[PDB]
Amino acid sequence: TAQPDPCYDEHGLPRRCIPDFVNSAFGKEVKVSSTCGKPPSRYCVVTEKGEEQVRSCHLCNASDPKRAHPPSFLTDLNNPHNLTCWQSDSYVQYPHNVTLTLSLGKKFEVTYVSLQFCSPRPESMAIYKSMDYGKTWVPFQFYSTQCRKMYNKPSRAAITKQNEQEAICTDSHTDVRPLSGGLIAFSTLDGRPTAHDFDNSPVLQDWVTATDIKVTFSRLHTFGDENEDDSRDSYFYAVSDLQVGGRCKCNGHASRCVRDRDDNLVCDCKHNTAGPECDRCKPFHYDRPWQRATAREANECVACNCNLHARRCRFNMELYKLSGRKSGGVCLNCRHNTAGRHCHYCKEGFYRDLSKPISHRKACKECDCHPVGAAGQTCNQTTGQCPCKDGVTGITCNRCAKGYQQSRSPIAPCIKI
Amino acid sequence: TAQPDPCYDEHGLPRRCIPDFVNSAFGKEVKVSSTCGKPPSRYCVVTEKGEEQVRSCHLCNASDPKRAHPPSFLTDLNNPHNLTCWQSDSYVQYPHNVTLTLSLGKKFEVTYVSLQFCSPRPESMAIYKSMDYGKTWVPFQFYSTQCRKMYNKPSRAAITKQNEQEAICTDSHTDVRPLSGGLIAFSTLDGRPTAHDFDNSPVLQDWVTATDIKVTFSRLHTFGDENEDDSRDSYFYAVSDLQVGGRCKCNGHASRCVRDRDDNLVCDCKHNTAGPECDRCKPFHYDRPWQRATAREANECVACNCNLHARRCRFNMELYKLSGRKSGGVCLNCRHNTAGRHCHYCKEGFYRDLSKPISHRKACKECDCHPVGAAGQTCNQTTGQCPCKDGVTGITCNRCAKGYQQSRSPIAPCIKI
Ligand SMILES: *[C@@H]1O[C@H](CO[C@@H]2O[C@@H](C)[C@@H](O)[C@@H](O)[C@@H]2O)[C@@H](O[C@@H]2O[C@H](CO)[C@@H](O[C@@H]3O[C@H](CO[C@H]4O[C@H](CO)[C@@H](O)[C@H](O)[C@@H]4O)[C@@H](O)[C@H](O[C@H]4O[C@H](CO)[C@@H](O)[C@H](O)[C@@H]4O)[C@@H]3O)[C@H](O)[C@H]2NC(C)=O)[C@H](O)[C@H]1NC(C)=O
Ligand SMILES: *[C@@H]1O[C@H](CO[C@@H]2O[C@@H](C)[C@@H](O)[C@@H](O)[C@@H]2O)[C@@H](O[C@@H]2O[C@H](CO)[C@@H](O[C@@H]3O[C@H](CO[C@H]4O[C@H](CO)[C@@H](O)[C@H](O)[C@@H]4O)[C@@H](O)[C@H](O[C@H]4O[C@H](CO)[C@@H](O)[C@H](O)[C@@H]4O)[C@@H]3O)[C@H](O)[C@H]2NC(C)=O)[C@H](O)[C@H]1NC(C)=O
Numbered sequence: 159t160a161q162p163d164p165c166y167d168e169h170g171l172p173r174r175c176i177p178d179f180v181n182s183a184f185g186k187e188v189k190v191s192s193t194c195g196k197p198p199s200r201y202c203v204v205t206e207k208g209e210e211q212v213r214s215c216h217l218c219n220a221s222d223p224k225r226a227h228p229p230s231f232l233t234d235l236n237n238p239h240n241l242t243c244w245q246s247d248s249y250v251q252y253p254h255n256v257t258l259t260l261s262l263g264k265k266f267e268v269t270y271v272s273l274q275f276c277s278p279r280p281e282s283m284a285i286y287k288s289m290d291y292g293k294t295w296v297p298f299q300f301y302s303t304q305c306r307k308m309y310n311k312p313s314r315a316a317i318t319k320q321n322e323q324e325a326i327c328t329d330s331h332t333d334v335r336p337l338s339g340g341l342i343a344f345s346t347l348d349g350r351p352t353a354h355d356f357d358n359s360p361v362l363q364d365w366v367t368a369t370d371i372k373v374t375f376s377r378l379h380t381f382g383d384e385n386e387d388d389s390r391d392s393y394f395y396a397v398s399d400l401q402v403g404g405r406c407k408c409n410g411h412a413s414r415c416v417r418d419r420d421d422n423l424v425c426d427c428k429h430n431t432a433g434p435e436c437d438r439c440k441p442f443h444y445d446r447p448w449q450r451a452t453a454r455e456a457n458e459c460v461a462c463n464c465n466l467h468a469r470r471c472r473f474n475m476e477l478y479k480l481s482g483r484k485s486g487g488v489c490l491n492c493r494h495n496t497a498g499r500h501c502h503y504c505k506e507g508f509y510r511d512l513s514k515p516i517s518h519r520k521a522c523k524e525c526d527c528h529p530v531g532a533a534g535q536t537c538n539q540t541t542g543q544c545p546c547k548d549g550v551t552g553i554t555c556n557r558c559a560k561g562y563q564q565s566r567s568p569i570a571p572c573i574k575i
Numbered sequence: 576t577a578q579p580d581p582c583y584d585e586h587g588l589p590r591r592c593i594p595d596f597v598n599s600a601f602g603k604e605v606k607v608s609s610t611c612g613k614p615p616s617r618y619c620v621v622t623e624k625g626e627e628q629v630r631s632c633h634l635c636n637a638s639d640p641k642r643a644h645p646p647s648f649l650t651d652l653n654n655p656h657n658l659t660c661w662q663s664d665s666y667v668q669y670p671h672n673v674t675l676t677l678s679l680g681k682k683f684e685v686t687y688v689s690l691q692f693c694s695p696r697p698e699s700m701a702i703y704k705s706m707d708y709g710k711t712w713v714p715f716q717f718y719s720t721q722c723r724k725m726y727n728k729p730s731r732a733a734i735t736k737q738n739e740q741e742a743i744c745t746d747s748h749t750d751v752r753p754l755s756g757g758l759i760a761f762s763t764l765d766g767r768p769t770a771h772d773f774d775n776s777p778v779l780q781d782w783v784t785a786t787d788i789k790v791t792f793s794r795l796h797t798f799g800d801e802n803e804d805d806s807r808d809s810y811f812y813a814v815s816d817l818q819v820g821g822r823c824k825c826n827g828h829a830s831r832c833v834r835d836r837d838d839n840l841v842c843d844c845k846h847n848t849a850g851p852e853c854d855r856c857k858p859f860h861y862d863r864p865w866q867r868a869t870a871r872e873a874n875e876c877v878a879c880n881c882n883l884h885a886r887r888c889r890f891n892m893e894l895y896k897l898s899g900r901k902s903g904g905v906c907l908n909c910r911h912n913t914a915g916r917h918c919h920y921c922k923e924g925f926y927r928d929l930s931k932p933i934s935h936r937k938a939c940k941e942c943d944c945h946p947v948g949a950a951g952q953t954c955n956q957t958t959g960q961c962p963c964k965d966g967v968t969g970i971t972c973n974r975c976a977k978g979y980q981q982s983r984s985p986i987a988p989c990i991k992i
């Protein structure tokens with residue numbers, strides 16, 4: 159680890175390591191259902207400086223970068239004295255939802271998502287995630303005043319061990335005031351019966367995993383007095399930069415996340431692991447199956463030992479369990495005359511040449527029998543002794559014994575006296 | 576030997592035996608160069624009853640069975656009070672030879688050939704034999720008055736050990752008187768430097784061997800006084816039955832000689848021997864090579880032991896000598912999974928099933944390996960132990976050991992704890 163490498167310890171040998179925690183939103187462009195712009199639109203702010211509840215109406219023009227509120231302002235530079243704010247059309251209302259989506263383009267373990275509003279917080283909204291890259295969409299958290307009516311939800315009920323992957327519906331962070339600067343923040347891991355036990359809880363690891371994330375504002379609040387109608391008065395969504403705090407899901411096997419040949423984000427997978435999330439593991443590491451890392455056991459994939467005599471290999475769960483969870487990895491395409499599980503013994507008509515280690519290419523000489531002197535071409539595949547005929551000693555059977563005279567006739571090449 | 580069998584002794588086991596000694600001429604038709612017949616011919620006899628040297632001339636007519644002298648009379652019923660006589664034309668003279676031939680149609684060891692004449696004996700003649708059935712002809716004995724002139728022969732010279740197969744030329748049995756009843760008789764084995772040692776002398780065994788036999792009368796005697804010319808006076812050949820005493824050559828391996836499927840004479844070969852003369856030996860008796868019989872060692876051919884697992888086999892002279900003259904006979908087409916010289920051990924991918932004797936058909940079980948449990952299909956071919964993989968005991972490798980747990984995965988079917 160002669161630079162930063164947290165993945166390998168000071169022995170040299172591997173442990174567990176995580177990519178750095180980030181705002182995965184900054185610089186990354188957000189898709190929206192409703193920007194005011196075309197047409198240029200009325201909007202009003204009711205502002206209580208002093209104690210005076212004053213109405214100030216303005217011009218929402220996406221053609222003018224001084225009056226424009228594009229989705230760019232959701233992931234620009236945050237600076238709360240100088241709030242840059244995306245803004246929607248007015249009184250898009252229940253049933254009609256404004257949605258926003260952010261695609262990460264990579265599985266992230268989500269810690270939180272925060273939305274800072276320069277408008278009132280929604281009366282009713284919901285957050286959604288995608289496990290796949292935007293195909294199915296999965297509920298995450300609901301924020302309705304009337305859960306039973308709106309989302310067919312119990313209001314602030316139980317999370318059990320059976321359904322820890324459960325969105326609660328909660329009349330909270332759904333207050334009208336603050337009229338400006340209100341926070342939505344959802345944290346994934348609150349309220350789970352293994353909240354503590356995240357390294358060791360797979361159901362929670364899946365919960366927080368997501369590729370794309372989607373916010374849905376489903377209703378607004380109307381203040382409910384006689385004003386004089388103003389049209390669509392001041393009822394719109396607007397947010398002054400967003401954050402999605404998360405870590406790049408590499409299952410504890412990778413150092414940092416990097417841009418690809420294909421200009422996609424992937425894990426720089428370290429521990430003989432493979433794929434985008436390091437969620438399978440590398441070819442010819444199929445001795446011992448895939449598992450997520452922890453500090454306890456780094457749990458990583460390890461090479462099939464085929465002795466330099468094979469390149470393709472596969473796992474066997476059966477052999478893994480009957481090896482006592484040590485090894486299930488068996489070799490195919492056995493080269494250099496080798497055979498059996500680990501390409502470990504010489505195939506028939508070769509015997510093991512012990513003068514040479516197994517990793518040596520000629521680890522296995524041919525039986526090399528004298529065809530006349532041998533009663534068989536296949537030798538015993540470890541002793542290398544070809545079976546000789548009546549008194550034809552020698553490994554290759556290339557020689558008469560003492561007491562046996564040589565002939566030239568090949569059916570009877572040695573004979574007694 | 577529940578009938579005559581001299582070939583097998585009272586143990587049951589074989590010794591040496593010979594066919595009976597015969598006149599091989601009787602009943603068998605003789606080929607000739609000169610019969611008087613057509614035309615009917617003059618012939619005279621000069622006969623000294625009392626003391627009177629009287630000339631009696633007669634009529635030689637093959638159309639009249641009372642005056643006919645056909646070659647039939649060379650091998651008819653002998654009865655010297657009643658002489659039946661074949662007769663030639665008169666004064667066929669040097670250079671002109673009358674020849675006779677007798678084909679036996681079977682190799683015979685000749686003892687003697689006797690010709691009894693009712694005429695004077697030839698001044699000059701010769702006997703010939705055929706080793707092959709009448710192709711080459713080989714000289715045998717010469718009977719000239721002037722050997723040097725007639726046959727380019729020394730008169731009564733030496734027989735050496737280098738040329739025991741040598742016809743002598745001998746002015747003997749070449750006397751004019753007897754004018755009637757004279758004998759030619761040639762005995763083969765006279766005068767040989769291993770005359771005694773016939774069972775043990777191969778060069779003499781070849782000498783006396785013959786298939787066809789040929790007599791050649793090359794000159795006559797003329798009495799040389801002034802008579803009154805008589806024409807062709809009385810100068811002809813005539814013989815009153817012939818004999819060829821011999822034994823049917825079966826090289827001491829056969830009981831008697833018998834007529835074939837093809838109506839040819841052959842040896843009834845007994846001692847696992849084969850051919851006409853028993854002069855090779857039978858298929859699948861090529862352990863230990865062919866040899867003639869004697870009383871000393873019957874020397875006979877003996878079966879290749881291929882253990883009921885082969886039918887074709889061959890000899891090896893090299894293996895015979897290095898077996899110490901015991902066995903040179905090796906097996907081909909090894910059935911029932913057997914292998915090696917005598918089809919004696921199990922071929923690769925079978926091992927020897929000792930529960931069963933070698934002559935049993937299933938003397939050799941398949942390795943019969945458990946294909947999953949074995950690291951090899953070929954077992955050690957006597958132990959029958961297929962090479963099992965990591966802790967898969969058993970001969971067929973059909974079982975995990977104690978301390979090894981069974982899997983269903985075929986690359987790792989047993990595993991420790
Ligand atoms: C939050 O607001 C979102 C916007 O909607 C507004 O507010 C709501 C309350 C209503 O008053 C509505 O009228 C307003 O406009 C709202 O999202 C919308 O939700 C509806 C219902 O879930 C979606 O409708 C369905 O659309 C699909 C097709 O559209 C999709 O695919 C096409 C491509 O083919 C895409 O281009 C679209 O973008 C979509 O992705 C229909 O197939 C489906 O039909 C169903 O209903 C009909 C009868 O109407 C039946 O006969 C059928 O069998 C089906 O059952 C729906 O019509 C709508 O797509 C979605 N719009 C947008 C723009 O995302 C969200 O639901 C609001 N939340 C709540 C809780 O109200
Ligand atoms: C015992 O008498 C036998 C009969 O002969 C009579 O007496 C002799 C002395 C002469 O006076 C003769 O003229 C009398 O008729 C005698 O047998 C004969 O021997 C001769 C010489 O060895 C044989 O001659 C050779 O014949 C072959 C071909 O004939 C053979 O094959 C045919 C088939 O193609 C058959 O049908 C025949 O039956 C034969 O089997 C010739 O190729 C060969 O030619 C050679 O000589 C010429 C010149 O003349 C050369 O140019 C060549 O290059 C050759 O060298 C011979 O002519 C004859 O076949 C044979 N006849 C019979 C009926 O068997 C025997 O030799 C007398 N014994 C002694 C010691 O005199």
Ligand SMILES: *[C@@H]1O[C@H](CO)[C@@H](O[C@@H]2O[C@H](CO)[C@@H](O[C@@H]3O[C@H](CO[C@H]4O[C@H](CO)[C@@H](O)[C@H](O)[C@@H]4O)[C@@H](O)[C@H](O[C@H]4O[C@H](CO)[C@@H](O)[C@H](O)[C@@H]4O)[C@@H]3O)[C@H](O)[C@H]2NC(C)=O)[C@H](O)[C@H]1NC(C)=O
Nearest residue numbers: 195196197198199216217218219220221222223224225226
């Ligand atoms: C919403 O946001 C938009 C900003 O994008 C505001 O638009 C401005 O509106 C004023 C209205 O008076 C525009 O001013 C007038 O434009 C007339 C036409 O000018 C056009 O073409 C010239 C070039 O040929 C451009 O430079 C100009 O931008 C326009 O596109 C002029 O006839 C007027 O002239 C008078 O004032 C000028 C001041 O420079 C004097 O020089 C002249 O002599 C004369 O007295 C006048 O300029 C202004 O152009 C718009 N600005 C921009 C940045 O687009 C909307 O007004 C705003 N509010 C609402 C309620 O919608």
Ligand SMILES: *[C@@H]1O[C@H](CO)[C@@H](O[C@@H]2O[C@H](CO)[C@@H](O[C@@H]3O[C@H](CO[C@H]4O[C@H](CO)[C@@H](O)[C@H](O)[C@@H]4O)[C@@H](O)[C@H](O[C@H]4O[C@H](CO)[C@@H](O)[C@H](O)[C@@H]4O)[C@@H]3O)[C@H](O)[C@H]2NC(C)=O)[C@H](O)[C@H]1NC(C)=O
Nearest residue numbers: 537538539540541542954955956957958959960961962963
């Ligand atoms: C090449 O091929 C040959 C044969 O084809 C193999 O050799 C045979 O090897 C086995 C085991 O290697 C020999 O014997 C058997 O050993 C069993 C285990 O004990 C051994 O190992 C333990 C430690 O693990 C030692 O403490 C112990 O001393 C042994 O060395 C025994 O359980 C067996 O005994 C049983 O059978 C015998 C008869 O065989 C009975 O009499 C007993 O009562 C008991 O029931 C057994 O002794 C075996 O004998 C070898 N063969 C021959 C012919 O002698 C090579 O090992 C093989 N190698 C390869 C890799 O291919």
Ligand SMILES: *[C@@H]1O[C@H](CO)[C@@H](O[C@@H]2O[C@H](CO)[C@@H](O[C@@H]3O[C@H](CO[C@H]4O[C@H](CO)[C@@H](O)[C@H](O)[C@@H]4O)[C@@H](O)[C@H](O[C@H]4O[C@H](CO)[C@@H](O)[C@H](O)[C@@H]4O)[C@@H]3O)[C@H](O)[C@H]2NC(C)=O)[C@H](O)[C@H]1NC(C)=O
Nearest residue numbers: 612613614615616633634635636637638639640641642643
């Ligand atoms: C050599 O050997 C042959 C033997 O094969 C002798 O041949 C005999 O020769 C005599 C000569 O006189 C033959 O006899 C005469 O044959 C004449 C013709 O007959 C032929 O046809 C009849 C049937 O039609 C046959 O049966 C017969 O065999 C002949 O083929 C006759 O005209 C003669 O007839 C006279 O005698 C007979 C005897 O029976 C009387 O009945 C008649 O009336 C008449 O008087 C006479 O028969 C004789 O046939 C031959 N015999 C045989 C067995 O063939 C040679 O003679 C002998 N010698 C010499 C020197 O060559």
Ligand SMILES: *[C@@H]1O[C@H](CO)[C@@H](O[C@@H]2O[C@H](CO)[C@@H](O[C@@H]3O[C@H](CO[C@H]4O[C@H](CO)[C@@H](O)[C@H](O)[C@@H]4O)[C@@H](O)[C@H](O[C@H]4O[C@H](CO)[C@@H](O)[C@H](O)[C@@H]4O)[C@@H]3O)[C@H](O)[C@H]2NC(C)=O)[C@H](O)[C@H]1NC(C)=O
Nearest residue numbers: 537538539540541542543544545546954955956957958959
């Ligand atoms: C199946 O396959 C296995 C192995 O593939 C064979 O088993 C091996 O068999 C050999 C011989 O059968 C074992 O050992 C060697 O034996 C030599 C001969 O001695 C044996 O036989 C004589 C009688 O003929 C006995 O008196 C004697 O006690 C032995 O039983 C020794 O000369 C060898 O010793 C030499 O090598 C050793 C090291 O191996 C040295 O330390 C010595 O100094 C010396 O130089 C040797 O001991 C051999 O060990 C077996 N294998 C294993 C792994 O143990 C089966 O026989 C075979 N069968 C068939 C038919 O296929």
Ligand SMILES: *[C@@H]1O[C@H](CO)[C@@H](O)[C@H](O)[C@H]1NC(C)=O
Nearest residue numbers: 224237238239240241242243
């Ligand atoms: C930001 O600061 C400037 C002075 O530098 C001030 O004129 C401006 O009105 C401020 N903007 C907001 C939106 O508070």
Ligand SMILES: *[C@@H]1O[C@H](CO)[C@@H](O)[C@H](O)[C@H]1NC(C)=O
Nearest residue numbers: 641654655656657658659660
């Ligand atoms: C044979 O015997 C008979 C009498 O039975 C006699 O007439 C005949 O002449 C004899 N033949 C010879 C050739 O001696």
Ligand SMILES: [Ca+2]
Nearest residue numbers: 231242398399
């Ligand atoms: Ca901002």
Ligand SMILES: [Ca+2]
Nearest residue numbers: 648659815816
């Ligand atoms: Ca006669």
Ligand SMILES: [Cl-]
Nearest residue numbers: 493494519520
């Ligand atoms: Cl290589």
Ligand SMILES: [Cl-]
Nearest residue numbers: 910911936937
């Ligand atoms: Cl069979």
